[PDB]
Design a protein around this ligand. Sequence first.
Ligand SMILES: [Zn+2]
Lengths: 84, 78, 198
Amino acid sequence: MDFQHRPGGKTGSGGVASSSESNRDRRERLRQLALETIDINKDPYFMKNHLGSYECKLCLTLHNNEGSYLAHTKHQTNLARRAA
Amino acid sequence: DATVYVGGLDEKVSEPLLWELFLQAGPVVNTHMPKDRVTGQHQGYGFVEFLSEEDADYAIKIMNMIKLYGKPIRVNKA
Amino acid sequence: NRFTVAELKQLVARPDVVEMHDVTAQDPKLLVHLKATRNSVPVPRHWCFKRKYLQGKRGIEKPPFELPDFIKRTGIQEMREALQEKEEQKTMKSKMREKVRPKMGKIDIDYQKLHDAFFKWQTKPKLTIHGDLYYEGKEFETRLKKPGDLSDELRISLGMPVPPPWLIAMQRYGPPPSYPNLKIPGLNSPLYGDVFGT
Ligand SMILES: [Zn+2]
């Protein structure tokens, strides 16, 4: 057989991860991307709870997902209200 | 003159240490100890609003002789 | 239709147990009689609040956990955190490689240390009273530190041996007007440890 034209595979691989492992890896990567964009934007309103949840201290609003806080950018009117 | 300015302290004497000294000596209803936005450290002087003017008078007269964190704490009427 | 707080204070032997809105109850005298017994508990404060119970924090941070002394004396936290930090740097290629080729003997300490920490090193913890009711605070006012007694940190900071420098002025000034029922031992009521008064 064409050994140099078979699809590539290596011994001792372990296989492809399941849906749950890929889902939690995607969630961890989304958390890392959200933290990278928060550190790039340098927003001090972001906080992580003791139970591990996103919180807007300028809005005082909890967020279930990272994109919930990423869409929380109302926040300008709440920042103007909490400025004084 | 329920509010009394308490100073002459150091970084070890904080708002909770002043609250413990108040619970020893004379009760204070509120505490006002603002801090800077860059340093964020206690200056040792804060406005303790007492529940009565006699408590602030006893803090200014009798309790203004302690050594809070090595420095002599002085309470003045405010 | 219902009497005022003065009639409830005169009728009941305990006027301090009469609430502000207890007069609008259908049986205010029976509620005052039930509230005046030795083994009663108050209503939790959330019935008057619009806020739900322990719900409106929303912005504070807390420490995660404080383990007891025998569990930390077994020391499971050290290699547990080492294993978590080692697994955090692993890739998913290495994760399924370890899944198909496992490596045991990670902790592998003994059974006798956990048996001793469960039984020989078992310590009874601190439990509160039967009438205690936790609320939104109940974690900060731990003085119930007696009044009329200086703290140990203030005694160490002012150089008070166990003679404070302001104790002579406190003895010459009499009792403070903020706490007239507080008695300071050693100078006014002639005091073990830092609690030199009550
Ligand atoms: Zn916001």
